Design a binder for this molecule. Structure first.
Ligand SMILES: COc1ccc(-c2c(C(=O)NS(=O)(=O)c3ccccc3)n(Cc3cccc(C(F)(F)F)c3)c3ccccc23)cc1
Ligand SMILES: COc1ccc(-c2c(C(=O)NS(=O)(=O)c3ccccc3)n(Cc3cccc(C(F)(F)F)c3)c3ccccc23)cc1
Lengths: 17, 272
């Protein structure tokens, strides 16, 4: 997860909503 | 491989690229050039036209992100960096569509984007630029090179490199088909700092490089050296990013009021 919290969340499966 | 699969890769990637990136190079070139029907960007070339322009685009971001209170050189810089953040998000969604990427180690997925996004942003910026200015607001406005060249002191010297880059890069006459694969190849670079498992990244990239070689053969049969020129551009873009990072970190000490979106802070954190 880091450290790169936002980037890690963007990388989640999903798709922005 | 093997023609039908490299062609189906190229096609998958183009279809994703069009879903991921709102303004294609085709549509940007149509705008910059005159055409479409759909008729004709607002131009920013002075303070009065900047303020006329800001009123067309302000509904776009919540109220704080307008940074009304800041001098214009800084609002323009804040506006680019926020558009760059929107770029990282489009590139991330693009990257997820590259066969095999999402099966990589998640930490490697993060590292590939960390190190990849700036080079991609420079390539996207070139599709939006000609010798005279840059398309903004998703092609709805156009900011002149001379206007940006007239910003104070630090900032006004700093766009001219973007422009000279774009001019040489756009001289390659790449289409969106070519750009989709070129971008995927930059993302899947096996030599980024800290990669855990390099082999599966190189392995994907190898497929991507074979798709790109086939694409340029078919789409630019009159330019036998174009693949080689494109690989050279990838080296240029690394060195450009290097330069940019080193500059940011020396300028930001002078320019209190300059703030990085936290997504970009994490990106810049261990970045070279
Ligand atoms: C106010 O004048 C500007 C405004 C923006 C830029 C500029 C720049 C720019 O930073 N170029 S720069 O020469 O390195 C520079 C650094 C620090 C202060 C001013 C200028 N970039 C590159 C880029 C890519 C990703 C992320 C960012 C950042 F987060 F820092 F915003 C910047 C651009 C990319 C697209 C559009 C414009 C730029 C250069 C001068
Ligand atoms: C009124 O303030 C503005 C208006 C427009 C822009 C602006 C813009 C622009 O499109 N920005 S914008 O989305 O319309 C925007 C305006 C105000 C606040 C946030 C965002 N661009 C295009 C741009 C910048 C960075 C990254 C990319 C991309 F990744 F796609 F390649 C494209 C610029 C390019 C050079 C100089 C300025 C800009 C920046 C500030």
């Amino acid at each position: 997860t880091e450290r790169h919290k936002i980037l890690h969340r963007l990388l989640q499966e999903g798709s922005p909503s | 491989p093997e023609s039908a699969d490299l062609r189906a890769l190229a096609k998958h990637l183009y279809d994703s690229y069009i879903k991921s990136f709102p303004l294609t190079k085709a549509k940007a070139r149509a705008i910059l050039t005159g055409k479409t029907t759909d008729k004709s960007p607002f131009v920013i070339y002075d303070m009065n036209s900047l303020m006329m322009g800001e009123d067309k685009i302000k509904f776009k971001h919540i109220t704080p992100l307008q940074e009304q209170s800041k001098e214009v050189a800084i609002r323009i810089f804040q506006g680019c960096q926020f558009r760059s953040v929107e770029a990282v998000q489009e590139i991330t969604e693009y990257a997820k569509s590259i066969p095999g990427f999402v099966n990589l180690d998640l930490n490697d997925q993060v590292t590939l984007l960390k190190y990849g996004v700036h080079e991609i942003i420079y390539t996207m910026l070139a599709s939006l630029m000609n010798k005279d200015g840059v398309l903004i607001s998703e092609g709805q406005g156009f900011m002149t090179r001379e206007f940006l060249k007239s910003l104070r002191k630090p900032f006004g010297d700093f766009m001219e490199p973007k422009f000279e880059f774009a001019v040489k890069f756009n001289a390659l006459e790449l289409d969106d088909s070519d750009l989709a694969i070129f971008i995927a190849v930059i993302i899947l670079s096996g030599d980024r700092p800290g990669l855990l498992n390099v082999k599966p990244i190189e392995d994907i990239q190898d497929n991507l490089l074979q798709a790109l070689e086939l694409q340029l053969k078919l789409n630019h049969p009159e330019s036998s050296q174009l693949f080689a020129k494109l690989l050279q551009k990838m080296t240029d873009l690394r060195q450009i990013v290097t330069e940019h990072v080193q500059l940011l970190q020396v300028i930001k000490k002078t320019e209190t009021d300059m703030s990085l979106h936290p997504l970009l802070q994490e990106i810049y954190k261990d970045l070279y």
